[PDB]
Amino acid sequence: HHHANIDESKIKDTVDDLIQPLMQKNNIPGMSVAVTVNGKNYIYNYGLAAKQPQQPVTENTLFEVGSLSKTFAATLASYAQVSGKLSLDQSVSHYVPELRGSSFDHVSVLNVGTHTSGLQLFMPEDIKNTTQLMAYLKAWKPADAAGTHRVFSNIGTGLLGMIAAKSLGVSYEDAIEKTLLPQLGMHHSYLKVPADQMENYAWGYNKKDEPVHVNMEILGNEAYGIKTTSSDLLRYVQANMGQLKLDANAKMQQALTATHTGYFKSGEITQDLMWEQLPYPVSLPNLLTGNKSVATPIVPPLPPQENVWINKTGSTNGFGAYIAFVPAKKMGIVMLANKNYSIDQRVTVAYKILSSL
Ligand SMILES: *C(=O)[C@H]([C@@H](C)O)[C@H]1CC(SCCNC=N)=C(C(=O)O)N1
Secondary structure: OOOOOOHHHHHHHHHHHHHHHHHHHHOOOEEEEEEEEOOEEEEEEEEEEEEOOEEEOOOOOEEEOHHHHHHHHHHHHHHHHHOOOOOOOOEHHHHOHHHOOOHHHOOEHHHHHOOOOOOOOOOOOOOOOHHHHHHHHHOOOOOOOOOOEEOOOHHHHHHHHHHHHHHOOOOHHHHHHHHHHHHOOOOOEEOOOOHHHHHHEOOEEOOOOOEEOOOOOOOHHHHHOOEEOHHHHHHHHHHHOOOOOHHHOHHHHHHHHHOOOEEEEEOOEEEOOOOEEEEOOOOHHHHHHOOOEEOEEEEEEEOOOOOEEEEEEEEEOOEEEEEEEEHHHOEEEEEEEOEOOOHHHHHHHHHHHHHHO
16 A cells, blocks of 8 residues: 555655556566665566466566676676686686687686677577587687677676686586575575476567577576576675675675676776676766777776666566666666566666666
8 A cells, every 4th residue: 555755655656657658668568676775675566477377476576687697607706706716817718728729818707707808799509518619619719809899798708607617616507506696695596497486487578479488508597597586686786785794705795896896998888797887976878878899998997886877787588687776875776577678768767766766
């Protein structure tokens, strides 16, 4: 029930007024929006996780988050770094000996953590196993030297997560589901959704409005494997702002914070470890203009800041996700949808909601 002067109702009015038209105009079946401010959390669910038979979005609905998954690979690499197992400045072939003598002698772990190796966006469809992947990587050359340009890459994020996990002595899937997500308290976050949660796994709806789930291919866990709830992602946002006890895991807090280090500038955007940031306050135009480019190194790296807007978009064929948070304001938003709608609208709605707080 609505109550004037009560936090949850004031925020709900703002969120409803933006999300209901957004869902109508884009024919988005279902969304969940989670907001944190002043140490308090608010979760709003809209519409349908599935159309036939109908299932509503609930607190337990799982959405695919696409390239938001890359921030977990970065957090894992950062955890390995702060634990003394990984140096970001070292070469990929230092950690992957089969690539020694290849172009990966000249690509750093930082490059694959910042989209500056030059590897292309999509894994080639005919690469099915590790032998084929290594043969491809050993024979690969970019047109420009590593460190010169920013090219968003699922392959690069794959290498980042693989190297981080190996440096901890485990597979990536183990590192994420047995180490990282449990230490973050994200108990409804998965690379593979278990049987008791399938009833909660929303269907995605593609451009033709067909129900779809993402197909997991080689190195896909690193780049697009996460399925999660808005509540778990809001915990992740709070952890990224140092707000949670985190079971006294000092190394994990340091790992999260260190992913916000600013390593390259492209246009107006600062590239962190997978996260992207802009100075705060942000104007909507610069946010929108932010969504190969020349990459200029920031050296020494920009330390993790408070006065910034940190964000990440992610999509799959059937889903569209967005996170933004402002550490100086201890505020953040997670928007999950089971339809891939345009990034300009994600950032505009998030900006309007956070501005209202
Ligand atoms: C991620 O959503 C897909 C991946 C699952 O194939 C692609 C498309 C995007 S493009 C850059 C988004 N800009 C700012 N946040 C990426 C990605 O790395 O974000 N990979």
